[PDB]
Design a protein around this ligand. Structure first.
Ligand SMILES: Nc1ncnc2c1ncn2[C@@H]1O[C@H](COP(=O)(O)OP(=O)(O)OP(=O)(O)O)[C@@H](O)[C@H]1O
Ligand SMILES: C[C@@H](O)CC[C@@H](C)O
Length: 271
């Protein structure tokens, strides 16, 4: 289900790629904010979009449709340019909200909903006809809509930050379990409110994974890891189960890490 756009249409959509509509340029290329009006494409509702200038694969991407995957609306191939048109995620990436000092906009139930939605999207990608695996799955791959519903971005386009599973750093072999490790790191970020690696913290606290691991089996000392801004919003039972899910996902042994569908099944009851 993909619309084909010309560059002329995308100039209308992005106000000729105006400097004001540029929102950033990561590893996969620049992204511009835009708008499709009701008349822009037959059968396409008016909406805000994100246009990536990428730096037959698109037909497969168009099949990866799921409530927790950012929708690919269409594409444009012209004069050696390859552009992708996605639904615009109104609240942007999870790290903008989570790495705030307090992250008071993300109460416990919202963080659980984000964790569950991201797990559902990753399980869908891993269970696809051709398994879709990230090279660098991290917090910024989770984008948020106006309801803080989580949807995964940059799927199918493919360790200093701390999201790379240790065996992947050493070998570079892409496996679904490497994504599960990164998911576990993000879950620890959601539980703790802390970035995965923060060199300004004391040496033993720099790595969120290395520092939190001994505490994830200690229910009476789990409060040291939990975000202080969440105090009073969670039961110890729910916090310890979520911590145990994260603990399993960041297991040094990849065979210990769960399938993402099992992560969904373990986290959904906490809501
Ligand atoms: N569909 C979308 N809706 C809203 N914002 C988006 C969308 N896709 C990308 N963005 C935002 O556009 C900016 C550039 O995205 P990009 O993915 O290139 O950079 P990044 O995610 O910060 O870096 P990297 O992907 O290399 O880790 C980021 O702020 C990103 O969150
Ligand atoms: C703009 C009109 O010529 C249609 C463009 C196709 C490629 O969708």
């Amino acid at each position: 289900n993909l619309h084909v756009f010309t560059i002329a249409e995308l100039r209308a959509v992005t106000r000729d790629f105006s400097m004001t509509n540029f929102i950033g340029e990561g590893g996969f290329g620049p992204v511009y904010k835009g708008y499709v009006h009701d008349k822009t494409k037959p059968g396409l509702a008016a909406q805000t979009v994100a246009v990536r200038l990428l730096d037959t694969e698109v037909f497969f991407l168009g099949q990866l449709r799921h409530p927790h995957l950012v929708k690919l609306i269409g594409y444009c191939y012209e004069d050696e340019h390859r552009l992708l048109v996605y639904e615009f995620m109104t609240r942007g990436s999870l790290e903008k909200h989570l790495f705030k000092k307090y992250a008071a906009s993300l109460p416990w139930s919202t963080r659980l909903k984000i964790a569950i939605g991201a797990a559902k999207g990753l399980a869908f990608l891993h269970e696809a006809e051709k398994p879709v695996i990230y090279r660098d799955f991290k917090t910024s791959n989770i984008l948020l809509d106006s309801d803080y519903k989580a949807k995964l971005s940059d799927f199918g386009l493919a360790g200093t930050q701390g999201y790379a599973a240790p065996e992947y750093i050493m070998t570079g072999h892409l496996t679904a379990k490497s994504d599960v490790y990164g998911y576990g790191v993000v879950l620890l970020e959601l539980l703790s409110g802390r970035k995965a690696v923060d060199k300004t913290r004391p040496p033993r606290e720099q790595s969120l994974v290395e520092w939190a691991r001994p505490y994830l089996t200690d229910a009476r000392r789990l409060d040291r890891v939990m975000d202080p801004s969440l105090a009073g919003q969670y039961s110890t039972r729910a916090a310890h189960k979520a911590a145990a899910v994260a603990h399993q996902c960041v297991a040094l042994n990849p065979k210990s890490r769960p399938h993402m569908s099992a992560v969904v099944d373990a986290l959904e009851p906490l809501l």
